Amino acid sequence: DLDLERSNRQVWLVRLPMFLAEKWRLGKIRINKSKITLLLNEPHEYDLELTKKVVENEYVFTEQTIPKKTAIVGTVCHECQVMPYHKIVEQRRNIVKLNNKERITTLDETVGVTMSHTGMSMRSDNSNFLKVMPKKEILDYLFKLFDEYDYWSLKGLKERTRQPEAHLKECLDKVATLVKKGPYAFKYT
Amino acid sequence: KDQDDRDHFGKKRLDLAGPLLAQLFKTLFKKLTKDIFRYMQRTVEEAHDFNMKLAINAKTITSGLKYALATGNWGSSRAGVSQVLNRYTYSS
DNA sequence: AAAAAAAAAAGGCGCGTATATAAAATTTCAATGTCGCGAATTCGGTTGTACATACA
């Protein structure tokens, strides 16, 4: 169900140097006939250079198997890139070639204090991280659970009845169907 | 164009101590990564108590290098890379 | 200036360390002890054409 909003919206994609694109995450195009220029919004004045006069087979679409809400914005009308005021742009450009990154912090303490710690600091678990029956009463309960459930499991009876296991099984041995084989295994009906 | 000379010196590189330790270190660091993971896996898989010093066996590295210096054995897979220094006379 | 409230801190307190003794009652546990699961294995019936051959 693809939709075509315009497919004809003339658009000029541009490639940019890093700073302005980063600053772009307005202006005024002063076309001069064809020394096209642009008066940016305050900041510098960067003209327009014609990276590619005519641009084809390239269009703008949108998104919102699984299809999605997709529309056709328009065709790229003409490609441009940028001429970047200038010396400062030139200065920062050459200045940009002067990056850096961290080296190693050696440990300025003397070593006993640094090295006493990773052995026997005497302190542990500072952080929480992966710190991990009556014969009558048993028979009445066993009959009840069997009456409550034909699949009255023995260990489940033991856990639920909270009675000694030997007394519960004796209760279930005669008051319930002692099943240890078959599809209904561990079921006392 | 001619067959490439494979001996033009420019196509050589010299894995000095720096890059060589990298090899030795990097791989030996894996032997750390695996092991903790192993023990880590165990303690949870048996709800034991998470202790750090058991968790990381330090020797895994220190024993690795100290050995792999002490003899040019470099893994095996290579030898002749570490020598006693030759203190005969200065130029030597 | 004064009352009042809030908070820190101090100190002694109880049986978790040791140890010997008995009592018993629970809990947990370890050392085998019976239950299915997929693979492993061998037998004749069917079929088609030949080929002789006889009733309709």
Place this chain on the structure above:
DNA sequence: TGTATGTACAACCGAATTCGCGACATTGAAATTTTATATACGCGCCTTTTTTTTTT
């Protein structure tokens, strides 16, 4: 003259049948369990005390 018949001798097929690992359940047991008492240390925790802070 068309047909019915007994019998063949050869390649095809699937049908039906019996072996051990894993799941736990088993009972076996120890360990833990609670109590007195001296010893002393060192866990933490109780209340109280005192102090500090705030507000009127």
